[model samples]
Target chain A: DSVTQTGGQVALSEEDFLTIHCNYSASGYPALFWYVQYPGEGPQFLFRASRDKEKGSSRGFEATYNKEATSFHLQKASVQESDSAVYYCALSENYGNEKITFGAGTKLTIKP
Target chain B: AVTQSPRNKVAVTGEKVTLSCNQTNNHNNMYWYRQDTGHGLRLIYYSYGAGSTEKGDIPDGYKASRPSQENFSLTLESATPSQTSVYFCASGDASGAETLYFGPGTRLTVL
Candidate 1:
């Protein structure tokens, strides 16, 4: 039915671990996506998955869809200052026909 | 190249703001969607299948149009501070794992 994100804002030093929690509620199967948005730009596609237990990863970030848990958490082993941005978790039901639903967003600030 | 006009703009209260997007590598499904400010990105209005403009989630004060194959527009009849946000235009399909390619963005401020 919708998507939600935890951790409104997170701060960390360079090389620190990073995780942005995402969860969704839908009656039918949906395709999940992680998008990163830098200042003055739109959300860019980071990665995505369509099936249960599918893993989507890109740019040192990754997430696995869990139909049982209804969650798709974004994670990075070590973060950099350049990784500071707003991350969004989105889902599109009915494959690619329907529009997507996005989470509130998680603002990550990485110190230098 | 998908691009939005007036990359940065400031509009007064009750001002009529028309945001524009043009050229998208010939993808018919264009979206005048996604506004990111504080509460993530929300869908406004969309230029969907066969050039039809559909009302989005928060569609009370927004209007969408398909001027041509190369141009898409989103207009705010009377701009208010609540309407101020960074709007993005995107184009792509759901044929497979394809993602919607997005424009840079248009930053608008309502005063």
Candidate 2:
């Protein structure tokens, strides 16, 4: 896997904080991405990173790119039951390449 | 808006399944990807321009074609149960921010 996650499944309570780690093995891809897929929908773009110091964020989820460590970790300060979904970390060979290599998704379950 | 038709489908084994996609944003890049439990997401095929298609790493029994600027199609020559999965189509710019706008997926079942 070009991209890998620390945990396969995580369970959390409402308003709790969570961090999902996404580590990449590819050395050339400058862009890192996080995508979220709901139960019956397609994977939606959560955020993206282009530079080493850049942080991509959306819908209260955030991920920062670390070039030195080749890691882009997804974080959320608070989560709700509606936030239950599969989260994927992906890498692109270049900034504009549509061919993305994705990690085995991390399934997140937020409880009431 | 990027959209896919035949949101849910069922096909017999050894039959053909054609998944169609359309992107209205005039994006230069279009991609087909499949999702499964252990295999997060895998690229099937992608097109960079009108009538220009390229196979991805996992293109074995799938054939793709881009007949126009807005349409791309993925056809499974002989559908198998192993080929049954949720397929997604995405459109994005060719040389820019690399944000892929995805369409609602097509759920395929081969029995």
Candidate 3:
């Protein structure tokens, strides 16, 4: 019954650098994913990782897969108010498994 | 485009609720996920074939039906305040390695 959960809520001023961590537990090789959600919108795919050495990044947000630690951390530099949203870390057992395990989500607020 | 019907709704407790979804790309995999405060994101149901449905790890009060390859529906046998949250439907290719496209989401409230 355990699921993905973010580190915590983060509030920062513009131009602040931040890193959000995601952790999960599942069987088999899991593909890690990062999604960003804005108000009144569904979660949008930001990036994904399929292998232990893979790195997925977009829009200045980057995350690396650490197989030994069972983690995929999302990091960004100089965030803006427009970057304010809930970030979710997710994973699936493998390709072809439609069921994705997701973290609780980290609510990020960026101040002007 | 992935579209959901009745973008927002309010349902009475103990009433039945049904949310509909349609994906244009003929994807074989469809998913239903719910977002709540503490739970974050949770899978409710998903389908990999037309006329086939599978329950997720959550509770049993929820049921899903995939009538066609392009459509999937989730129904709550009896709604409760705990069920109030935004519901999202997503679709992926048969390979499951591609990105999942999500609908605009349905905001439901249980009164």
Candidate 4:
């Protein structure tokens, strides 16, 4: 199983739209997730998927899981400087075992 | 809530280091994991329940013990300078919609 994010970093001005592309490869049915991490903190769960074509949204962030593309991309209409952090894409092949595999992560920097 | 002890630790090379974690929510699944920029989130070990542990992908130098339902420990035998990094403890339950929750993390530095 593997999880891949867009890249190492993204930069945008305040109120600019945001997008973090995430892709995964796994056996069985994969449940994807988005996690955010600030400086000096562990990654925190943002949202996740239930099945293919399902969308998960929380705190103004949203993502839709596409099975054909094996992708779950995070997006926000308007971003703030507070959104500057590292974002990670994760996958779980079995919810019963709940072993989450995380991507290398994309660090977002929003300048005000 | 989940919490990890020894928020910051410094150990010499070849010394044994034990990290402790406690979860008040009483989740059945607990994990001992670490993070690094180069490696991302790496699972060292995880326990499904008390007294049983499954070594994860990067468990070569680490051992884990779950003494009770609420406690899990990770021990690094013969610590190395390269082991310096932040470690996290997480708790979750598979029976519900509940998801994994992480602790503040412990910063361990070996010299």
What is candidate 4's CA lDDT for residue A102?
82
- Per-candidate Cα RMSD to the true structure, in Å, reads 1.7, 1.6, 1.6, 1.4
Clash counts for all predictions: 2, 0, 2, 0
| Candidate 2 collision pairs | none
lDDT of 1 by residue, B7-97 (tens): 9999999999999998657766677775654667787877655467878788888998986767788999999998878888876556735
lDDT of 2 at B35: 86
TM-score of chain B of each: 0.88, 0.95, 0.93, 0.94
- Tens-place lDDT per residue, model 3, A14-107, is 9999899877676767788898999988888898888997999998999898878888889998897789999988886545455778888999
Error (Å) of candidate 1 at residue B4 is 0.3
Give the best candidate by DockQ. 3
Error of 3 at B109 (Å): 0.9
Which sequence of candidate numbers ranks them by lDDT, best first? 2, 4, 3, 1
Better of 1 and 2 by lDDT: 2
Any runs in candidate 2 off by more than 4 Å, and if so which?
A96-98, B94-96
**True-vs-predicted CA distance for residue A76, candidate 2, Å:** 0.7
Q: Poorest 10 consecutive residues of model 2 chain B by lDDT?
A: B92-101
